[PDB]
Curated annotation (Swiss-Prot):
Full protein: residues contained: 1529 to 1680 of 1706
Domain remark from Swiss-Prot or TrEMBL: The Gly-rich region is probably involved in binding calcium, which is required for target cell-binding or cytolytic activity.
Designated name of the protein: Bifunctional hemolysin/adenylate cyclase
Source species: Bordetella pertussis (strain Tohama I / ATCC BAA-589 / NCTC 13251)
PTM annotation, UniProt: Released in a processed form.
Purpose: Bifunctional adenylate cyclase toxin-hemolysin that plays a crucial role in host colonization. It causes whooping cough by acting on mammalian cells by elevating cAMP-concentration and thus disrupts normal cell function.
Taxonomy, superkingdom: Bacteria
Record family assignment: In the N-terminal section; belongs to the adenylyl cyclase class-2 family. In the C-terminal section; belongs to the RTX prokaryotic toxin family.
Record's subcellular location: Secreted
Ranges occupied by Hemolysin-type calcium-binding repeats: 12-29, 30-47, 48-65, 78-95
């Protein structure tokens, strides 16, 4: 358990199950190993769950969520912001996109690691706007499309 302030803070967990709350300001939150609960709150925050199964709450403002190979199975609960982003440490060639109920689900092909965006489909507030792969970026429209195409045909490398 670590708290920031209304200033811009840097919060780093350890290998246990941690709670990090940035409060207002533009914060960096890193969970490390274990199942962490990361709360950006107000401000433009940078959240990494790192290893383990992490719950990531960027909150209001435009938050950046890190994911990659070996990051386990993380869920984003967004609250608000017009330019929330996900940064993924793998090429667009190795991502898969699918809808699970109201959730958007991103898997890294042939690994275990999953990134879920809770209630993606339910309302705008819950959406993340841009996903950067290792050099490329697709937008909400591009995402909800790849989802449809990958579900229909695969034929995007089965
Ligand atoms: Ca913050
Ligand atoms: Ca802060
Ligand atoms: Ca941790
Ligand atoms: Ca973690
Ligand atoms: Ca935030
Ligand atoms: Ca946000
Ligand atoms: Ca993780
Ligand atoms: Ca958003």
């Amino acid at each position: 358990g670590a708290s920031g302030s209304a200033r811009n803070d840097v919060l780093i967990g350890d290998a246990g199950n941690n709670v990090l709350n940035g409060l207002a300001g533009n914060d960096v939150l890193s969970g490390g190993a274990g199942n962490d609960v990361l709360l950006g709150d107000e401000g433009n925050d940078l959240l990494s769950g790192d290893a383990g199964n992490d719950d990531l709450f960027g909150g209001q403002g435009n938050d950046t969520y890190l994911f990659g190979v070996g990051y386990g199975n993380d869920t984003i609960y967004e609250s608000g912001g017009g330019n929330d982003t996900i940064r993924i440490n793998a090429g667009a060639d190795q991502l898969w996109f699918a809808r699970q109920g109201n959730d958007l689900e991103i898997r890294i092909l042939g690994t275990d690691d999953a990134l879920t965006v809770h209630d993606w489909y339910r309302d705008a507030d819950h959406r993340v706007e841009i996903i950067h792969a290792a050099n490329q970026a697709v937008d909400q429209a591009g995402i909800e499309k790849l989802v449809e195409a990958m579900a229909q045909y695969p034929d995007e490398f089965t």
